[PDB]
Amino acid sequence: MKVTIIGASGRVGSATALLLAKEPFMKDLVLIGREHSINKLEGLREDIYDALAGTRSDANIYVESDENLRIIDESDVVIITSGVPRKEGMSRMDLAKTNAKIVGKYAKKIAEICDTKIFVITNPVDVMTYKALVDSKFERNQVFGLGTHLDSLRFKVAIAKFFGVHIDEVRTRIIGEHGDSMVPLLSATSIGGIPIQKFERFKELPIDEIIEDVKTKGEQIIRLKGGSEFGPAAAILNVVRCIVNNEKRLLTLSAYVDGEFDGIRDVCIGVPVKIGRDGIEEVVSIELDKDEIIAFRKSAEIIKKYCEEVKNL
Amino acid sequence: MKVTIIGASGRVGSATALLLAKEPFMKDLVLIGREHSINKLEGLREDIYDALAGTRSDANIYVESDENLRIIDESDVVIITSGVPRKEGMSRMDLAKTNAKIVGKYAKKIAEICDTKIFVITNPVDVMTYKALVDSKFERNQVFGLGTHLDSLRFKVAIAKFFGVHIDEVRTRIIGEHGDSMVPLLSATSIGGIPIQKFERFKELPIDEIIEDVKTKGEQIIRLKGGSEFGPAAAILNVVRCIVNNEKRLLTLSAYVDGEFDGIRDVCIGVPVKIGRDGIEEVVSIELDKDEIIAFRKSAEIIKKYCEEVKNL
Amino acid sequence: MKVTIIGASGRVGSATALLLAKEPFMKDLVLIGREHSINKLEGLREDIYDALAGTRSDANIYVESDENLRIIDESDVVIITSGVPRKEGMSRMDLAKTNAKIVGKYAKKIAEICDTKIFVITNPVDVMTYKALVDSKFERNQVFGLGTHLDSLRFKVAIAKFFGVHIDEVRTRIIGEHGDSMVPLLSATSIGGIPIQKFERFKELPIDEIIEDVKTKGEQIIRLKGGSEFGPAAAILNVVRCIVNNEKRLLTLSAYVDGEFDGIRDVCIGVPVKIGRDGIEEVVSIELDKDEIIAFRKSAEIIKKYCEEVKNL
Amino acid sequence: MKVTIIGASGRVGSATALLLAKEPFMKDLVLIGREHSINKLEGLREDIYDALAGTRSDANIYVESDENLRIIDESDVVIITSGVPRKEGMSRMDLAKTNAKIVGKYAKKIAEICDTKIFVITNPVDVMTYKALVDSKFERNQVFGLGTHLDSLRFKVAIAKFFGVHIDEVRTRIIGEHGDSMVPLLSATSIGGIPIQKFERFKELPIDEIIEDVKTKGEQIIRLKGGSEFGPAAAILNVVRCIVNNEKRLLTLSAYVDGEFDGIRDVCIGVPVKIGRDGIEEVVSIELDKDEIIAFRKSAEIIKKYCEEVKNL
Ligand SMILES: NC(=O)c1ccc[n+]([C@@H]2O[C@H](COP(=O)([O-])OP(=O)(O)OC[C@H]3O[C@@H](n4cnc5c(N)ncnc54)[C@H](OP(=O)(O)O)[C@@H]3O)[C@@H](O)[C@H]2O)c1
Ligand SMILES: NC(=O)c1ccc[n+]([C@@H]2O[C@H](COP(=O)([O-])OP(=O)(O)OC[C@H]3O[C@@H](n4cnc5c(N)ncnc54)[C@H](OP(=O)(O)O)[C@@H]3O)[C@@H](O)[C@H]2O)c1
Ligand SMILES: NC(=O)c1ccc[n+]([C@@H]2O[C@H](COP(=O)([O-])OP(=O)(O)OC[C@H]3O[C@@H](n4cnc5c(N)ncnc54)[C@H](OP(=O)(O)O)[C@@H]3O)[C@@H](O)[C@H]2O)c1
Ligand SMILES: NC(=O)c1ccc[n+]([C@@H]2O[C@H](COP(=O)([O-])OP(=O)(O)OC[C@H]3O[C@@H](n4cnc5c(N)ncnc54)[C@H](OP(=O)(O)O)[C@@H]3O)[C@@H](O)[C@H]2O)c1
């Protein structure tokens, strides 16, 4: 497999390449970055190689500037971690608009070379996955983002821990914006197959305190850290493994929806999809509950607003 | 960890010891059998050792006759595969009664040495797990059997395959007798967390044709095979891994129930339980549907009948 | 990958298919056998499927009689476990001659369909790998056998255990006949890279007692066992993994040698080779010691004798 | 197992904690750092937890300032990555002396709390492992460093790649200073067990060009990178796994030697040792070649010089 990472120099970009180089399926890992951060990549390539010293690996790592993405052709998927590390004076709209030009820039540049899967990690993930789709001019099945996938795993752990059951016995998810307006679906949450609602202990699940932490895990940023390292990479790797192996998992990624959920059209948002060797092979439409769909409505509304301000940058 | 297998000479006993010797947690594997089949075990020990040649392992394999189970003390769990390979003239009651004396025999002999977990594999698994419990005089949390666990995985595969979703995205189970009266619970079956009922395609799930095959997988026996080899061993290993690692999974094993499910008392049957380092740490009681509990009632009735005929052998 | 096993019904054949079905690289596993043992295979297929219940696998298992090997075309490798379970009255020459017709039979039948790698397991492994090569009319790089590979791992364990070092820190091997005339090469035996000879404790290595056990591990047969189950399968799986993944390992398999070792020509014997995606890609010729080559000479002599008696059957 | 990392905030410290938290054997991971970098650790703890989201783990992560190492008691091993990131004006002696006070500081502080294994990563690794030993006042078996272990793996890859053999078929090592004076031992280098010298292609092994790169991999630092990230962490994890599992591997770590190699006394240097549950359980003394021991003599001389300047800081 051939994966390309755009922004392999950043924390997540680095962590992600590391994990991807260890994969048996990784044949050509292309680390792309701007002309001035090319030494940091070659520095990364040498570092990764050390971490692989002793284990079998045919991972060919390549480094290039974001000028001639020619080498990125035939990539099974192209990840994008590029983006401005936010900033004090920066506002949500201010942040949206900025990375928009960065993701779009790459989206377009990529699109010229070929048709590949664009896995958008940079924030606002939804608004950015939207942008990449618009500027890439790709099919809705080729562009998706990390969305609420990690928030979902984060919600899964909390619950499994609350009930004292093996992590695997739980399956839940958060749909909507990968932000304050994210919607947790307890209607699609089972404990060992059994709807969480069929358990007494459920009535005592600190759902609000829990969502609060999930929602605000942007505390990696504030908590003396750049913003995120391994958390994301770990998720990304999973999603890539899902694609290359055509796993057909029912993840919750930021994908383009259009009616699958009544009242939600023309917007990239965190929704359940079936991921396989062809990207977002389906936007699973299941009946939510009264308030879940009301809340899922408001979330998309928020996101759409930004999508407009960005659609033409 | 110290596991003992009673019947390590049979197909399943052999396959199971093989898999268990490869486990990092296996410290002392005791293979027990009758005086005349001791050469087959030492023959097994040497064989397993070959399969381990090249891989790290501190698995001490021991062989002994079923006369002085002294060596089986301090075992974390004792598996029992011993039993008559059924027979043409043999009837269900005829078969029940026979293995009953075999499992009970061991149950009692084991009980004398110490208090351990007794994992009963021999059939009728439910009726035999019941017997082992009665003759072992152990706590309901220390005696359980394979029950409908493999039938559950078997049902899981079929479904995941019917919907074309990753095996992991499905969680379902069959409660009741590990036989013709087994009950599939589609009320505790989720696809990616979503109740299977919330999918249109569900309406077309060949639930009857499917259960038929699961139910009658006693075709290993008839289909030019002794009766089962790896299928079971693979399951057993999982369940053991679940215990040693205190996984806290919500499996469906043959355990002693008593009211957890209204209308079901004094019987060992396939029911959902929370398995950990202390065996059946809980018999999860969830509200079934109208017919699931009606059918679960009839199953237990059947099983109980046999339990009586065996209670004092 | 597409592997075919000829004799999937035997102990090793069964164990091997089990292990191979679990491999991520196994796409189509063809289990071939005679018309009367077709139910035992379908019985095996169903059993294996149970052991896979719960884990991802795209392993398509197929069953067919040894009449129309048409289905075995495009197989990356074809394993052969078919053979007479030896017998009391049977003599080495008697045994050689018999399986010769069986392996040759299949060799020829396979050859007609296509050009594939023939991995010969049945004994006498050397004499049988020779035969399969002769009757298959394949290139010396496409036909090889288990030879002294397991005897080598067996020797490795013994040593590592004698020095009290991690299994991985040892690399040794036995060349020659997979029989009484096998030759252990302590000249190609390192402990952590260091020639075993550079260790004082070496002087006390029970090399003779050790080789005796290795040599006579045909005690699985006598020790109340058919003859071997998992030991072999475990090895086979490794060797197949080596091929499919073009590992380029320096194993010790029964391959066709012709001068690589001075004084050893026109014979299939246990010798060091470089295994990859193209089979025996090289018969590594390293200078042995005075007696190692003298002993390696006698071994080949023995084997050759049988090869003649079989060359035209 | 309880591991403590001193400097969990640095690149290697972070990467290492990540890898260690994923280990099944990791029960309590203590991340220690100075009062001002405590938010970076809690930020790390939250990040790691995200990378673990979905996988089983009982890894309790703890964060504390380097004031009251009370919590670090009962640690199976304490890793030390603390140290000054070198500097332009800084000279080898200047660098040695500085980190000396840092490692020694911690060494002493640790020693007060209890007797544990001190795994010294900070440079100069040899001179620093020496210091930690001196200020910890521990037994020579409890203090060791990364030394030439990664340089050894680095040499292993290069070779295996030069011969086109599976990575596992090679075992070589570099003894001496983890610096310009490092000594490669081709006398303890086997290819598939066979002394590398017994291969013709060996005569063409670019041993000098190769060692040059290994030696100067301090190019991570210069090549737009802090200095090293995953390379080290990957190694460290291995060495820890080696300890917790009492693997008994013959690694090449920076340990205290005293005569094991004639002409080498009172110095911590990269030498072959047997690592197990008790640390450096033996300093393997094998006869080197004429020049290997001459070169190994000069290396130790260099290192000793620094050890003096540091012995009392
Ligand atoms: N999903 C989550 O939970 C989560 C959490 C935190 C952060 N994030 C997002 O994921 C990314 C993580 O960032 P990080 O830790 O990797 O490091 P960083 O320093 O925030 O970002 C480094 C990356 O941004 C690129 N970049 C910076 N300025 C640029 C510009 N003007 N034009 C184009 N590219 C530019 C860099 O490329 P060059 O080297 O070529 O400049 C590099 O690829 C961000 O986009 C962030 O918004 C997601
Ligand atoms: N859950 C499932 O899906 C499933 C499927 C098939 C079978 N099974 C059950 O699992 C077991 C599988 O049998 P198998 O393939 O391992 O081989 P087998 O030949 O059916 O059984 C061999 C075992 O039975 C013991 N045994 C035979 N006669 C005995 C006697 N009179 N007293 C005490 N022990 C006796 C043997 O012990 P000695 O060597 O000491 O005689 C050995 O441990 C059976 O009990 C069977 O009912 C379960
Ligand atoms: N490396 C070692 O140390 C070691 C040790 C022991 C054994 N082994 C090897 O491992 C294998 C063990 O044998 P096993 O457990 O597989 O069972 P087995 O009973 O020895 O062999 C069964 C196989 O032989 C076939 N067969 C028997 N008679 C035949 C005939 N007249 N014509 C054609 N095919 C015939 C069977 O086909 P049907 O079912 O169609 O009849 C079946 O495929 C052997 O091949 C042996 O060489 C290796
Ligand atoms: N084997 C190889 O080839 C190789 C190559 C390169 C590097 N490495 C090693 O790997 C490590 C890389 O360093 P890094 O990424 O961890 O980050 P770094 O910036 O080099 O070191 C950070 C650590 O040093 C501590 N520290 C800094 N100044 C200190 C002082 N004055 N007193 C006490 N502690 C002080 C920090 O504590 P606070 O955060 O509390 O200040 C933190 O724990 C080094 O130890 C180096 O020796 C090995």
Distance CA C162, CA C156 (A): 10
Q: State which ligand 2 atom lies nearest to the alpha carbon of B125.
A: 1
Q: Whose CA is nearest to atom 33 of ligand 3?
A: C102
Element (H, E) at D44: helix D38-51
- Cα Rg for chain B, rounded, in angstroms? 19
Q: Which residues contact D172 (CB under 8 A, 6 or more apart)?
A: C193, D152, D155, D156, D159, D184, D185, D186, D188, D189, D190, D196
Distance between start and end Cα atoms, chain D: 32
Q: Produce one character per residue of D128-142: b if its CB has 16 or more CB atoms within 10 Å, e if not.
A: bbbbbbbbbebeebb
Report the SS3 class of residue C236. Answer: helix
Residue of A43, A53, A103, A106 lying closest to A75 (CA atoms): A106
Q: Which residues contact D204 (CB under 8 A, 6 or more apart)?
A: none
- Which residues 187-216 of chain C have a CB within 8 Å of chain A? none
Element (H, E) at C308: helix C290-311
Look up residue D258 and give its two tokens. 């005293």
Q: Are C124 and C210 in contact (CB under 8 A)?
A: no
Question: D83 CA distance to ligand 4 centroid (A)?
Answer: 4
Q: Is the dihedral of CA B271, B274, B275, B280 positive or negative?
A: negative
Q: Give the distance from residue C41's alpha carbon to the nearest chain B alpha carbon, in angstroms.
A: 8
Contacts of C224 in chain B (CB under 8 A): 37-43
Question: C307 CA distance to ligand 3 centroid (A)?
Answer: 20
Sheet bearing A194-195, strands edge to edge: A170-171, A190-191, A194-195
Amino acid at B100: A
Q: Which residues contact A207 (CB under 8 A, 6 or more apart)?
A: A184, A186
User: Which residue of chain C is at minimal alpha-carbon distance from A56?
Assistant: C247
Distance between start and end Cα atoms, chain A: 32
Tally C-beta pairs within 8 A across B and C: 138
Residue with tokens 């180089």: A21
Q: Is the dihedral of CA B134, B139, B140, B145 positive or negative?
A: negative
Distance CA C69, CA C5 (A): 11
Element (H, E) at B62: strand B60-65
Residue of B304, B281, B310 lying closest to B144 (CA atoms): B281
Distance CA D238, CA A87 (A): 39
Distance CA B127, CA B105 (A): 14
Distance CA C281, CA D64 (A): 57
Q: Are B189 and B287 in contact (CB under 8 A)?
A: no
- Burial category of D70 from C-beta neighbours within 10 Å (exposed 0-12, middle 13-18, buried 19 and up): exposed
Residue with tokens 């990529």: A110
Pocket of ligand 1 (CB under 6 A): A 7, 9-13, 33-34, 37, 81-85, 102, 121-123, 125, 146, 150, 226-228, 232
Element (H, E) at D13: helix D11-22
Distance CA A135, CA A146 (A): 18
What is each CA distance from C43 to B15, B218, C35, C169, in whole angstroms?
16, 10, 14, 41
Q: Which residues contact D281 (CB under 8 A, 6 or more apart)?
A: D141, D248, D273, D274, D275
Rounded to the nearest angstrom, the gap between the alpha carbon of residue D88 and the centroid of all alpha carbons in its chain is 24
Distance between start and end Cα atoms, chain C: 32
Resolution of this deposited model, Å? 2.8
Cis bond upstream, residue C124 (ω within 30): yes
**Which residues are paired to A119 by β-bridges?**
A79, A144
Question: Is the CB of B218 inside 8 Å of chain C's CB atoms?
Answer: no
What is each CA distance from B295 to B171, B183, B251, B289, C297, in whole angstroms?
20, 7, 20, 10, 73
Question: Is the CB of B56 inside 8 Å of chain C's CB atoms?
Answer: yes
For domain A1-147, give its CATH number from 3.40.50.2000, 3.40.50.720, 3.10.590.10, 3.40.50.300.
Answer: 3.40.50.720
Q: Is C227 left (phi over 0), alpha (psi -120 to 50) or beta?
A: left
- Burial category of D224 from C-beta neighbours within 10 Å (exposed 0-12, middle 13-18, buried 19 and up): middle
Query: SS3 letters for A75-129?
Result: CCEEEECCCCCCCCCCCHHHHHHHHHHHHHHHHHHHHHHCCCEEEECCCCHHHHH
Per DSSP, C148 falls in state: T
**Which residues are paired to D32 by β-bridges?**
D6, D64
Distance CA A136, CA A106 (A): 8
Q: Is the dihedral of CA D3, D9, D15, D19 positive or negative?
A: positive
Amino acid at B232: P
Question: Is the CB of D43 inside 8 Å of chain A's CB atoms?
Answer: yes
Q: Whose CA is nearest to atom 5 of ligand 1?
A: A228
Q: Parallel, antiparallel, or unpaired: how do β-strands C2-6 and C28-33 relate?
A: parallel
Q: Which residues contact B282 (CB under 8 A, 6 or more apart)?
A: B273, B274
Residue of A148, A138, A147 lying closest to A117 (CA atoms): A138
Distance CA A260, CA A263 (A): 9
Do D53 and A224 make contact, defined as CB atoms within 8 angstroms?
A: no
Q: Are A270 and A184 in contact (CB under 8 A)?
A: no
Distance CA C92, CA C96 (A): 6
List binding-site positions of C for NADP(+): 7-13, 34-37, 99, 121-123
Distance CA A119, CA A279 (A): 9
Rounded to the nearest angstrom, the gap between the alpha carbon of residue C239 and the centroid of all alpha carbons in its chain is 8
Distance CA B14, CA D197 (A): 45
Per DSSP, A9 falls in state: T
One DSSP character per residue, B156-178 reads HHHHHHHHT--GGGEE--EEB-S
Do C250 and D168 make contact, defined as CB atoms within 8 angstroms?
A: no
Nearest to D47 among A167, A222, A231 (CB): A231
Residue with tokens 């995120």: A228
Rounded to the nearest angstrom, the gap between the alpha carbon of residue A201 and the centroid of all alpha carbons in its chain is 32
Report the SS3 class of residue D79. Answer: strand
Amino acid at C108: K
As a CATH number, domain A148-310 is 3.90.110.10
Q: How many C-beta atoms lie closer than 10 Å to residue A288's C-beta?
A: 20
Q: How many C-beta atoms lie closer than 10 Å to residue D266's C-beta?
A: 13
Residue A178: active-site member: yes
Do C171 and D171 make contact, defined as CB atoms within 8 angstroms?
A: yes
Contacts of B14 in chain C (CB under 8 A): 229
Mutation pick for ligand 2 pocket among B4, B5, B18, B34 (CB with most ligand atoms within 8 Å): B34
Q: How many C-beta atoms lie closer than 10 Å to residue B181's C-beta?
A: 19
Q: Are A255 and A281 in contact (CB under 8 A)?
A: no
Distance CA D117, CA D128 (A): 14
Distance CA D81, CA D87 (A): 17
Residue of C204, C303, C206, C313 lying closest to C257 (CA atoms): C303
Distance between start and end Cα atoms, chain B: 32
Top residue of A175, A187, A248, A284 to mutate, by most chain B CBs within 10 Å, is A248
User: Which residue of chain D is at minimal alpha-carbon distance from B242?
Assistant: D56
Query: SS3 letters for A282-304?
Result: CCCCCCCCHHHHHHHHHHHHHHH
Q: Whose CA is nearest to atom 9 of ligand 1?
A: A122
Residue of B156, B220, B218, B164 lying closest to B184 (CA atoms): B156
Top residue of D225, D237, D239 to mutate, by most chain A CBs within 10 Å, is D225
Q: What angle do CA C280, C284, C287 make, to 5 degrees?
A: 160
What is each CA distance from C65 to C17, C35, C102, C116, in whole angstroms?
16, 5, 14, 19
Backbone angles phi and psi of A278, in degrees to 5: -115, 25
Per DSSP, D26 falls in state: -
Q: Are B238 and B150 in contact (CB under 8 A)?
A: no
Helix D149-163 crosses helix D230-244 at what angle (to 10 degrees)?
Answer: 100
Pocket of ligand 2 (CB under 6 A): B 7, 9-13, 33-34, 37, 81-85, 102, 121-123, 125, 146, 150, 226-228, 232
Q: How many C-beta atoms lie closer than 10 Å to residue A59's C-beta?
A: 20
Q: Is the dihedral of CA C47, C51, C55, C59 positive or negative?
A: negative
Distance CA D187, CA D198 (A): 11
Element (H, E) at C290: helix C290-311
Query: SS3 letters for A139-181?
Result: CCCCEEECCCHHHHHHHHHHHHHHHCCCHHHEECCEEECCCCC
Look up residue C254 and give its two tokens. 């029964």
**Which residues are paired to C276 by β-bridges?**
C279
What is each CA distance from B98 to B36, B87, B304, B309, in whole angstroms?
20, 11, 17, 11
- Burial category of B103 from C-beta neighbours within 10 Å (exposed 0-12, middle 13-18, buried 19 and up): buried
Residue with tokens 């302590």: C186
Q: Are A228 and A221 in contact (CB under 8 A)?
A: yes
Q: Are B275 and B239 in contact (CB under 8 A)?
A: yes
Distance CA B193, CA B25 (A): 32
Distance CA C275, CA A87 (A): 56
Kindly list the domain boundaries of chain A, sorted by start residue: 1-147, 148-310
Residue with tokens 């095959």: B213
Ligand nearest to the CA of D103: 4
- Burial category of B54 from C-beta neighbours within 10 Å (exposed 0-12, middle 13-18, buried 19 and up): buried
Distance CA A282, CA B202 (A): 17
Look up residue D180 and give its two tokens. 């310009």
Residue with tokens 């752990």: A157
Distance CA B151, CA B147 (A): 8
Q: Are A110 and A233 in contact (CB under 8 A)?
A: no
Q: Are D3 and D223 in contact (CB under 8 A)?
A: no
Rounded to the nearest angstrom, the gap between the alpha carbon of residue C27 and the centroid of all alpha carbons in its chain is 22
Helix A38-52 crosses helix A11-22 at what angle (to 10 degrees)?
Answer: 40
Q: What angle do CA B240, B243, B248 make, to 5 degrees?
A: 125
Residue among C131, C178, C215, C304 flagged as catalytic? C178
Look up residue B189 and give its two tokens. 């079956």
Q: State which ligand 2 atom lies nearest to the alpha carbon of B121.
A: 10
Cis bond upstream, residue C195 (ω within 30): no
Do A47 and D156 make contact, defined as CB atoms within 8 angstroms?
A: no
Q: How many C-beta atoms lie closer than 10 Å to residue B55's C-beta?
A: 13
- Burial category of D246 from C-beta neighbours within 10 Å (exposed 0-12, middle 13-18, buried 19 and up): middle
Distance CA B95, CA B299 (A): 18
What is each CA distance from B233 to B147, C228, D256, in whole angstroms?
13, 18, 49
Residue among A109, A149, A156, A178 flagged as catalytic? A178
Q: What angle do CA A198, A201, A205 make, to 5 degrees?
A: 105
Q: Are D307 and D103 in contact (CB under 8 A)?
A: no
Q: Are B32 and B64 in contact (CB under 8 A)?
A: yes
**Which residues are paired to D31 by β-bridges?**
D5, D63
Distance CA B297, CA B183 (A): 10
Backbone angles phi and psi of C63, in degrees to 5: -125, 135
Query: SS3 letters for A193-237?
Result: CEEHHHCHHHHHCCHHHHHHHHHCCCHHHHCCCCCCCHHHHHHHH
Residue with tokens 């000793």: D304
Backbone angles phi and psi of A160, in degrees to 5: -50, -35
Q: What beta strand segments (E) does chain D contain?
A: 2-6, 28-33, 60-65, 77-80, 117-120, 143-145, 170-171, 174-175, 183-184, 190-191, 194-195, 249-257, 267-276, 279-280
Q: Are C220 and B43 in contact (CB under 8 A)?
A: yes
Element (H, E) at A6: strand A2-6
